[PDB]
């Protein structure tokens, strides 16, 4: 079976460098051009260069060259490729690319793919996060029903768990998946809806769990004044 | 190589949509991807199938325009569609297929808590659920003006049910805060908009 299969995602500081590799099996590495595309979340893939893998030659786009570095072990059947000084203009999945089993004069388009090396530069550090209530009001509370939740603010890395007392309360609990700020660090909400009535005789703690920073917090969210 | 081609297209299951790709050398290559997912060689030298590429998918091309055809849409073609030539690759189609009845968004916004107001900060969050197709635009108003400013939107995520729910987060200070007698969070679904508003205490 033709395949190309890369080394796992990497975290990387704002300076570092990074070497993604791809290994290729099925076919003759030497005999086809490994080409590397990148793709920024949500973006269009970017070309980033092809390399050789028969006498190591390489070419580069342009607003690579000095800065990428791809290489080959074609003893292993494994192409590496090495980007240096990284900012977060260079976070995206990086994948490896060839042509093999086309009936293709051109060498383009590539019809084999590695599964994609996430690369992700960021200057955020492992920080538990800080959590808001989220009060109940007259204007969350609707036909008996009141909407309550906590902002659980400026965590890193995912993930968090969200809980209501100690997951006693789960129906009509919704945990929004969380925002990644410009700062690097991530932001969620939690809601619950639970009966307006209910107010004040219930108490409704939201309990938040940051395995990777190790933090847990335990805060309630009761009407305001 | 600039390759151009529509943001978005849309279909119901079982009928045809066709993606345009307008540039020199285009549809040389068609891709499409699904999230987390390499993209998939489907189209190559304008209308040719690799081995594996479904019978539905067919390419054309008109002077210099590139056509991709699915023809009976199903819910497995709903992904991204790039075409490309040679190095350069075009900005991508998100191509929407209508697998559910039209669903308008439920919008819940939540002024910034006493809590954080005492740590010199303020957060409103406008929480969108329970909406179909995956799409909203998100505006913010201070009074009656705009801001886009310290604005953080999610990307829409499916929920349990199948619909979907998206987030945005309006950073301000505390005195941009309280120098204002509300603020509006307007989220656009389909041409036609919901509003909520929150005032300081
Ligand atoms: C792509 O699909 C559109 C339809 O969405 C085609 O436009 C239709 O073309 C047929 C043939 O001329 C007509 O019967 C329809 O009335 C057209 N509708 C509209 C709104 O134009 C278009 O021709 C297709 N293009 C390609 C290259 O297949």
């Known amino acids: 079976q033709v395949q190309l299969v890369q080394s796992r995602a990497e975290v990387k500081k704002p300076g570092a460098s990074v070497k993604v590799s791809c290994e290729a099996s099925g076919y003759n590495f030497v005999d086809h051009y490994i080409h590397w595309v990148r793709q920024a979340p949500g973006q269009r893939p970017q070309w980033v260069g092809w390399?050789?893998?028969?006498?190591?030659?390489?070419n580069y786009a342009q607003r690579f060259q000095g800065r990428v570095t791809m290489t080959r072990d074609t003893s292993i059947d494994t192409a590496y490729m090495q980007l240096n000084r990284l900012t977060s203009g260079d976070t995206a999945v990086y994948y490896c690319?060839?042509?093999?089993?086309?009936?293709?004069?051109?060498?383009?388009?590539?019809?084999?793919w590695g599964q994609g090396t996430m690369v992700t530069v960021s200057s955020a550090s492992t920080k538990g996060p800080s959590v808001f209530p989220l009060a109940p009001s007259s204007k969350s509370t609707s036909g008996g029903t009141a909407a309550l939740g906590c902002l659980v603010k400026d965590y890193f890395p995912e993930p968090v768990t969200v809980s209501w007392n100690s997951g006693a309360l789960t129906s009509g609990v919704h945990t929004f998946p969380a925002v990644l700020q410009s700062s690097g660090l991530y932001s969620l909400s939690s809601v619950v809806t639970v009966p307006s009535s209910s107010l004040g005789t219930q108490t409704y703690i939201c309990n938040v769990n940051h395995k990777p920073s190790n933090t847990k917090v335990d805060k309630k969210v009761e009407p305001k004044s | 190589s600039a390759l151009t081609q529509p943001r978005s297209v849309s279909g119901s299951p079982g009928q045809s949509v066709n993606i345009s790709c307008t540039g020199a050398?285009?549809?040389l290559g068609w891709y499409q991807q699904h999230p987390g997912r390499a993209p998939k060689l489907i189209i190559y030298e304008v209308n040719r199938r690799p081995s594996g590429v479904s019978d539905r998918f067919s390419g054309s091309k008109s002077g210099n325009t590139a056509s991709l055809t699915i023809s009976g849409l199903r819910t497995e073609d709903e992904a991204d569609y790039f075409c490309?030539?040679?190095?350069?690759f075009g900005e991508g189609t998100k191509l929407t297929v209508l697998s559910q009845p039209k669903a308008a968004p439920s919008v819940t916004l939540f002024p910034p808590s006493s809590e954080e107001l005492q740590a010199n900060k303020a957060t409103l969050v406008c929480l969108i659920s329970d909406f179909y197709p995956g799409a909203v635009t998100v505006a913010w108003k201070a009074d009656s003006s705009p801001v886009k400013a310290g604005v953080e939107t999610t990307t829409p995520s499916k929920q349990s049910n199948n619909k979907y729910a998206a987030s945005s987060y309006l950073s301000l200070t505390p005195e941009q805060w309280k120098s204002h007698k509300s603020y509006s969070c307007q989220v656009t679904h389909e041409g036609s908009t919901v509003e909520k508003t929150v005032a300081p205490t």
């Open positions: 390399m050789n893998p028969r006498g190591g030659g390489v």
């Open positions: 690319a060839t042509q093999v089993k086309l009936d293709s004069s051109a060498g383009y388009p590539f019809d084999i």
């Open positions: 050398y285009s549809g």
């Open positions: 490309s030539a040679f190095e350069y």
